[PDB]
């Protein structure tokens, strides 16, 4: 039979009937390239830290979405306040700087 055991950096001890116990440890030799493109970087950390990488990426996406939504809302709200004083004044000058930064 073929038996596969998971070995971590802590080590694994196995004893085969009447043989002395043997101890082995796993090195951090996972696949990937942490110095390459995002594809290779994520692959390396996923193989080395499966759960932490998944949690990390999900947390980053949540922070990005919350930050982008908040900033887009803040800018949309700001733009309305900037242009509303002129939208209600059909003959207003509408300064060129405001026309470029707000309109």
């Amino acid at each position: 039979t073929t038996v596969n055991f998971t070995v971590t950096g802590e080590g694994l001890e196995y004893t085969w009937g009447n043989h002395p116990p043997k101890r082995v440890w796993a090195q951090e030799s996972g696949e990937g390239n942490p110095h390459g493109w995002p594809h290779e970087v994520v692959v390396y950390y996923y193989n080395r830290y499966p759960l932490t990488t998944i949690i990390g990426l999900c947390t980053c996406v949540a922070i990005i979405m919350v930050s982008c939504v908040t900033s887009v809302w803040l800018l949309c709200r700001t733009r309305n306040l900037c242009i509303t004083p002129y939208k209600l004044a059909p003959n207003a000058q509408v300064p060129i700087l405001l026309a470029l930064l707000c309109c």
């Binding site: 080590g11 796993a26 090195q27 951090e28 030799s29 996972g30 990005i64 809302w73 700001t78 306040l81």
Partner: protein, 441 residues
Amino acid sequence: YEHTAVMPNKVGIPYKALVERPGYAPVHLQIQLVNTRIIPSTNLEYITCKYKTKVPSPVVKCCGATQCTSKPHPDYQCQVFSGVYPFMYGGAYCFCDTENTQMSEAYVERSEECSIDHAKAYKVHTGTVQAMVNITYGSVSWRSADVYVNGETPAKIGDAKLIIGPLSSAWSPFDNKVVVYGHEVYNYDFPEYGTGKAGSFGDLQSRTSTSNDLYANTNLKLQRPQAGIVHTPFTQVPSGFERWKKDKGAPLNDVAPFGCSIALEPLRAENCAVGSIPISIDIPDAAFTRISETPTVSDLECKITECTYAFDFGGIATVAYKSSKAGNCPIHSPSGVAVIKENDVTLAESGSFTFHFSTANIHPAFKLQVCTSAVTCKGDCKPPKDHIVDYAAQHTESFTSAISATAWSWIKVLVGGTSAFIVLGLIATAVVALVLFFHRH
């Protein structure tokens, strides 16, 4: 000079430090644990083994009757079987056909094998912790002594007095009650003396292997002798000790966490890598040399020529230096990023020397304390090629050990970009508020 520190509770991994005495050159200190033994206090509760059924000769009363009596024998059984008409080689033993009586007796006693093949039931309480420590300092060769890890009892190891603090963790693999059989220890909650059940572990219990008061709980029932046969038949539940041997399962020796090794003389758990161990060692005054009497190193330049964050000493570095007096110089790395293989180097007036180190970091950065001086070494380490190794890691991994420069770059960009985008929104909101204010005023 007393040097105090905290070393990890690891066997075979040496603790290295530089003993820095004001006004004297640093003395390299290396403390290594050879073994660590947790020796609990044990009280033998009783001894269990396979029972023997002793059956004295039956009493055959011809043309009459007899009566059984009570005796102190363990699990003693006595029954009077009337109407027996036994026959032997010489013919009918009794004259009467149905008026004869046979009395059978039987009792349980320890078997001969119980002298050797028996299980000891022990109650385990917190005991003591001892260790074998190998120490070398300065030019003194390796010396070792057996010490008590109490944090108070000092030990003299090569003119140095060592005090080892108690283990940071009170963890022990032994449960409150254990059963020792042969070389194996079982965390088995054995029944108390006098409550063992027939066909179970405690069916037979004895306070000692020589005790005269034996407890035996087997459903020993005397059967009626067969027609015309003089014998003492009986039924009894198979021994619960032999049944236990088949179902005893995995011993503590094979399931104890932290790689503990179990020994029986005395009962103890060895090399349990749990927590850390405080240490306090007094280095003799004669071991220190005045600073003015040792070499002075300057213009240290450290170049990492090759690095792999393998469990072995996969890193190689070259340090260029200039030194006066061209003497010997201790080498050390106080940062946990890398563990240095060499303890000291021989220095010339000028040149370079190489040292080996083991590091878990993909981009190691550590301070190398060249005697009385220091040099910062930085480099890039490649991943190890061997998937499985038969030796423990010589280094310590940290939370950020695996974070590469590219990983930090992306983290900084994501954190900085989102933060900058938030600030842009807040600033624009505040600026427009001022624009509206000026509209009214």
